[PDB]
């Protein structure tokens, strides 16, 4: 009575391929993302009805090349920017270089906005001691400074920008896009760059872009 | 003053290397060269397991050659019956970073762990019928990259904080710690007789343990990358490793050395996974250009491909009577060679 | 839709055309 | 709106009142008369010997409204007989009144679209092939394009029987059998499943065209939704919704103004059910494809000439949705006559039967994934 | 201190260096000959028969 | 065995200049692209120049641009920095860093605590 155990191991496989179904529809409709500042930190949060889950690595060590691969389908990473500076961006370079992470997004978020505005007077090290081509350098005439600030400000935020958008704008060949923020709602900008990533995404397999 | 301890070391290392070299009175190359090769060896595919969603790290076949859990990345357990394709147990896990899987001998067990740095054992046999989480092994520093049951109770594991690990599954406690690797251990591999072990890290260095002492036997170095993959020899006197450097390399325990190179100038892609066939004569090795090359491993020649997956081939297995290779991949798909 | 337009076009020519190569049999005698 | 069918009745209603006649006839009792008779085109009345006969010119004719005052001759000449000349052995006769005082160009059309679909036919059954064969391609978005493909060639070979039917039904076979007043294929439910089937896959491929546009919007609008249950309604709107609308017009062109195996819309009234259907696939296709564009042009300046990128991307997404139809949709057959209906009828047909062309190369053989599929396989194949 | 990890390389290096190491060609002359002893038992190497196989 | 030997450290004046070599050993030199890496006193491992694989794209730290300048030598498997106009700041302990995998254009964790294709260092004093 074989076919009588295989027609009850093909009992099971419906069962179980009922379920994973079920379970397709829950991970297609999720974005998870990284977050790059027990063994890993897990954040949901819900923004106009679309779930993001977050994932932030913890009680790992400083070496990622290994377990940085498993986050090569990502909808995005989200770098958070804080030597502190180039350590950054050179931890950029890698992610933005590396062959798995070369479809994947990131979002920059160039924290320490009040420190920066704060550390400018006559305190400003971070910028000008480790970046002497800053002091030959101009806020651009596009730039959209926020209401109400130092104009030694808004110079240090876009040069921080243009030191990232150099690295990525530096082949980027249209698989992976650069969203430098904090130069201008943290979920709601998340939010929005995902929904581009999604979009830029469909509009490749339709070979619209 | 520790730099006459760093130039002592610098002195038993030149020892150490001139014993190896007094040793290598012939190549392994040469006492092969008139033996008959293995020809062309030509895998089809024969089965495509279909069912997980985001890409798998890990499978490991069981002892009957035939049940098989497969690892992915979506949160899966997935236990394969490979003759009938059907699924047996779909087993949802609370951390979706999986990176490795295990398969108790006796069949009764499952084990997984990745990024939450936590080993996992599975009860498949239990009394209601569900599968329910058994232990959870905590104490690792870092992300679990392998794990390997002894037996029941026992399972060594592997971990991104260099070192490995004995447990006592009952008790849930660390029973031996494996110290000496400077990177992530990335893949251990029993010894036939389960009384040895070796250890590929991310220093491009591999160590054989002994399980009961619980030290270091040997450090074989050679490879110039980090080693993701290590598998033993059937008769437990040898093993092979796969690096980044895009090369395997074949290790003796008794010679304490290396032997053959897998390697060829088309290939610049790391190897991702390792293992030998029934009796040896074939290496077989994963790599990052989505293929799998047959390597003789008495000759050094590539003996054939394996050729059907359209991503990373993460993980690779021979069943435990030689008949059917597996692979799973970063396109989600598990296939069976044969 | 266009199909339709040109074949009841193509339809109508050739009703007429047949409509008027049956009084020309009559015409013939027949 | 004429029509033989009723040419041949008229005929037999004229051939039986003046039939009747020639038996009922009161004698003309003058000697020399002239012996009435019934040639299958007149009746003529006895006449007086060496005078002309006028006769009414026949009210049977097709063209008879034309002229109600014409006349048909023939003259007693005073022997009892009619005049007759050298090569020709009949009764002189005079039809100089009473006769009815471009194939190119449809035959110009019918040729493009031909070559059209036959092209486009053939290049859609290489191009489901090659999506059907490769699992890899497999996705929603490709069973979608299969759904559209099988709808591209099912409207081709609807054109080539309906080609072919017009030629059965009208026919030197056919015909005969219609002036012998015996059946016709015209009047068989077989030809006129044949335009029933005709208005089925044409409207069919004009809503799979909106399904493969409202399938991409809702990719684009960032809305995410049940896969396995959306691809069911998609199936049921592409394939169930034109019955909705081909089956009343059936209906309606049965139990209403059948004839002509329904080839001829005499109502024009009754052809709204058809045409309005897919005007809205017209112009929803029309409407999806303004917001796909602004979405394409916000994508491209994000990135800071756009306009080669631009126009690559609006020109690869016309023959996707069918949008070269809506620069001559409104343009309503009645109210399309003259040269006009030339250029509605030309840009129409020469743009749809070569509409499965594009479709195939942009969306099958020029896609970069198929490319891809064609490479990791000829290397594969030569390891053997 | 880092002198704490360098005295332990020195001891394991020590117990590392005194084994007993056996020649190349007599290692691998008995790899060579487990291959040969086991050659008919693998069957990736000598395909069986479409019968015995259970993937046929 | 991969191996990194950093040589030509020593003590300078301000505004001196001073050579740093390393030999490389264990692996193939020509494939990886090679870093130097600093750590001051109290300080962590800092990043300070990087070489490809061929010495075309070359780079460097912001506060040495156009006083250092690195330079491989593919033939011997010698990597060196050439310090000048050197800063009593520019006192640290100079490492030879290779990156993990070949023919790759990103370069992981070369500053990392632990990291194994890193030599001992030469001290080099302002
Ligand atoms: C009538 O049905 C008997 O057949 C002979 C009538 O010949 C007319 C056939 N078609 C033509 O002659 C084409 O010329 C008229 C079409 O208009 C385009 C300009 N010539």
Redesign the interface.
Same mark, same amino acid.
């Given at each position: 009575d074989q076919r009588n155990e295989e027609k009850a191991q093909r009992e099971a496989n419906k069962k179980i391929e009922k379920q994973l179904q079920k379970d397709k529809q829950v991970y297609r409709a999720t974005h998870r993302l990284l977050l790059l500042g027990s063994g890993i930190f897990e954040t949901k949060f819900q923004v106009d009805k679309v779930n993001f889950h977050m994932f932030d690595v913890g009680a790992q060590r400083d070496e990622r090349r290994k377990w940085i691969q498993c986050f090569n389908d990502v909808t995005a990473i989200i770098f958070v920017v804080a030597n502190r500076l180039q350590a950054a961006l050179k931890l950029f370079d890698s992610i933005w270089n590396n062959k798995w992470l070369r479809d994947t997004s990131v979002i920059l978020f160039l924290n320490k906005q009040d420190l920066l505005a704060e550390k400018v007077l006559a305190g400003k090290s971070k910028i000008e001691d480790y970046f002497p081509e800053f002091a030959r350098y101009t806020t651009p005439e596009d730039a959209t400074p926020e209401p109400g600030e130092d104009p030694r400000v808004t110079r240090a935020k876009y040069f921080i920008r243009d030191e990232f958008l150099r690295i990525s704008t530096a082949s980027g060949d249209g698989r992976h896009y650069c969203y430098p923020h904090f130069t201008c709602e943290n979920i709601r900008r998340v939010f929005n760059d995902c929904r581009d990533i999604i979009q830029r995404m469909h509009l490749r397999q339709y070979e619209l872009l | 003053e520790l730099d006459q301890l760093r130039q002592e070391a610098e002195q038993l290392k030149n020892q150490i290397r001139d014993a190896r070299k007094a040793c290598a009175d012939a190549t392994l190359s040469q006492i092969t060269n008139n033996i008959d090769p293995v020809g062309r060896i030509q895998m089809r595919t024969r089965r495509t397991l279909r069912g997980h969603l985001a890409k798998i790290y890990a499978m490991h076949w069981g002892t009957d050659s035939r049940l098989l859990v497969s690892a992915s990345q979506d949160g899966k357990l997935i236990i394969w019956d490979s003759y009938t394709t059907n699924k047996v147990h779909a087993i949802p896990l609370r951390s979706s970073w999986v990176m490795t899987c295990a398969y108790a001998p006796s069949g009764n067990y499952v084990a997984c762990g990745g990024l939450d740095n936590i080993c996992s054992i599975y009860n498949l046999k239990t009394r209601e019928g569900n599968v329910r989480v058994s232990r959870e092994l905590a104490g690792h520093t870092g992300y679990l990259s392998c794990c390997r049951f002894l037996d029941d109770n026992q399972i060594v594991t592997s971990s991104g904080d260099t070192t490995c690990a004995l447990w006592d599954i009952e008790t849930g406690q660390q029973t031996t710690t494996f110290t000496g690797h400077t990177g992530d251990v990335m893949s251990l591999s029993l010894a036939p007789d389960t009384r040895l072990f070796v250890s590929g890290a991310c220093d491009a260095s591999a160590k054989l343990w002994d399980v009961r002492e619980g030290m270091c036997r040997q450090t074989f170095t050679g490879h110039e990358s980090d080693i993701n993959a290590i598998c033993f020899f059937p008769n437990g006197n040898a093993f092979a490793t796969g690096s980044d450097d895009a090369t395997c390399r074949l290790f003796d325990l008794r010679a304490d050395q290396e032997l053959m190179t897998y390697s060829h100038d088309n290939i610049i892609c790391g190897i991702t996974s390792v293992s030998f066939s029934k009796s040896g004569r074939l290496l077989l090795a994963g790599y990052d250009d989505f293929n799998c090359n047959v390597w003789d491993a008495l000759k050094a020649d590539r003996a054939g491909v394996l050729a059907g997956h359209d991503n990373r081939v993460s993980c690779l297995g021979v069943t435990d009577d030689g008949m059917a290779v597996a692979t799973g991949s970063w396109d989600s798909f598990l296939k069976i060679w044969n | 839709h266009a199909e339709g337009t040109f074949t009841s076009d193509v339809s109508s020519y050739l009703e007429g055309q047949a409509a008027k190569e049956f009084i020309a049999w009559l015409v013939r005698g027949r | 709106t004429? *029509?033989?069918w009723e @040419?041949?009745q008229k &005929?037999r209603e004229y051939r039986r009142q003046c039939q009747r006649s020639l038996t009922e006839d009161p004698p003309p009792a003058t000697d020399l008369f002239c012996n009435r008779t019934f040639?299958? /085109?007149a009746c003529w009345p006895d006449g007086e010997p060496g005078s002309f006969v006028n006769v009414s010119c026949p009210w049977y004719?097709? &063209?008879a409204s034309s002229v109600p005052q014409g006349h048909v001759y023939r003259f007693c000449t005073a022997e009892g007989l009619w005049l007759q000349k050298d090569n020709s052995s $009949?009764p002189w006769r005079d039809?100089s009144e009473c006769e009815?005082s471009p194939?190119e160009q449809?035959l110009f059309? /019918?040729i493009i679209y031909t070559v059209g679909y036959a092209l486009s036919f053939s290049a859609l059954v290489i191009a489901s092939a090659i999506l059907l064969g490769f699992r890899?391609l497999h996705c929603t978005?490709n069973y979608i394009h299969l759904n559209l493909f099988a709808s591209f060639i099912l409207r081709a070979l609807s054109?080539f029987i +309906?080609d072919a039917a017009?030629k059965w039904m009208?026919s030197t076979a056919a015909?005969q059998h219609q002036?012998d007043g015996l059946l016709s294929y015209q009047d068989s439910l077989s030809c006129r499943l044949v !335009?029933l089937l005709?208005?089925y896959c044409?409207?069919a491929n /004009?809503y799979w065209l909106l399904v493969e546009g409202v399938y $991409?919007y809702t990719?684009?609008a !960032?809305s995410?939704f *049940?896969?396995?249950w959306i691809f069911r309604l998609y199936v049921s709107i592409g394939w169930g919704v034109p019955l909705l609308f081909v089956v009343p017009w059936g209906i309606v062109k049965y139990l209403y103004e059948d004839e002509?195996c329904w @080839?001829? %819309?005499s109502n024009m009234n009754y &052809?709204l059910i #058809?045409?309005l259907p #897919?005007l809205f696939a017209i112009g929803v296709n029309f409407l999806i494809f303004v917001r796909?564009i602004c #979405?394409?042009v916000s +994508?491209?300046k994000?990135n800071l000439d756009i306009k080669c990128r631009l126009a690559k *991307?609006t020109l @690869?997404?016309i023959p996707?949705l069918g949008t070269h139809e809506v620069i001559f949709a409104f343009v309503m057959?009645e109210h399309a006559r003259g040269t006009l209906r030339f250029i +509605?009828?030309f840009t129409?047909?020469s743009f @749809?039967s070569f509409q499965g062309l594009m479709v195939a190369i942009? /969306?099958c053989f020029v %896609? %970069?994934?198929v490319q891809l599929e064609f490479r +990791?396989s000829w290397?594969?194949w030569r390891?053997? | 201190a880092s002198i704490a990890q360098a005295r332990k390389l020195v001891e394991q290096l020590k117990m590392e260096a005194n084994i007993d190491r056996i020649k190349v060609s007599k290692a691998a002359a008995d790899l060579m000959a487990y291959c040969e002893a086991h050659a008919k038992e693998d069957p990736l190497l000598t395909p069986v028969p479409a019968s015995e196989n259970p993937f046929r | 065995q991969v191996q990194l030997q950093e040589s030509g450290g020593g003590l300078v004046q301000p505004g001196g200049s001073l050579r740093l070599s390393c030999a490389a050993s264990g692996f193939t030199f020509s494939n990886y692209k090679m870093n130097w890496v600093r750590q001051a006193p109290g300080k962590g491992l800092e990043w300070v120049s990087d070489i490809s694989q061929s010495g075309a794209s070359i780079s460097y730290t912001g506060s040495v641009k156009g006083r250092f300048t690195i330079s491989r030598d593919n033939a011997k498997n010698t990597l060196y920095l050439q310090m000048n106009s050197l800063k009593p700041e520019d006192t640290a302990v100079y490492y030879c860093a290779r990156c993990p995998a070949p023919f790759t254009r990103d370069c992981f964790d070369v500053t990392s605590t632990t990291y194994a294709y890193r030599g001992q260092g030469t001290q080099v004093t302002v």
């Open positions: - | - | - | 004429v *029509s033989l @040419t041949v &005929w040639d299958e /085109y004719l097709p &063209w $009949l039809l009815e194939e449809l059309l /019918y890899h978005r054109v +309906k017009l009208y015909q002036w !335009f005709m208005q044409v409207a /004009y $991409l990719l684009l !960032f995410v *049940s896969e396995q002509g @080839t001829r %819309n &052809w #058809i045409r #897919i796909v #979405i394409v +994508k491209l994000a *991307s @690869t997404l996707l057959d +509605k009828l129409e047909l @749809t942009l /969306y %896609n %970069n994934e +990791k290397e594969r390891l053997e | - | -």
